[PDB]
Amino acid sequence: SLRECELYVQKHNIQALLKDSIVQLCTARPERPMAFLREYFEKLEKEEAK
Amino acid sequence: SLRECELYVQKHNIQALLKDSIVQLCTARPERPMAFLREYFEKLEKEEA
């Protein structure tokens, strides 16, 4: 639903997550942004694991 | 500079790219958003190269 999505975005600070990812993207301006986004989230996943 | 960032974002369709990933994110609503986005972009990456 649309309300479930809005809720999810708020509860999990998705907006701030995008902001941080864009900040990174603009610092790096990678040849390959998908590869870069992959590594960026991989790094953050590892933080939230240990 | 800021202008180089705006330019990069437009040139590389960054906005739609990110938006598409969040739309998927909103459908799945995973307990682990980071892991999901990681897997999401890993998939798009593999077709980037």
Binding site: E6 | V9, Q15
Partner: peptide, 27 residues
């Protein structure tokens, strides 16, 4: 630097809008 982050916020809020829109079109 603050210029950057300010711009990142603007863009992120843009994406969040387009996401909500696309989420009304689907259900």
């Amino acid at each position: 630097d603050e210029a950057q982050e300010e711009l990142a916020w603007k863009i992120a809020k843009m994406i969040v809008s387009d996401v909500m829109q696309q989420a009304q079109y689907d259900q």
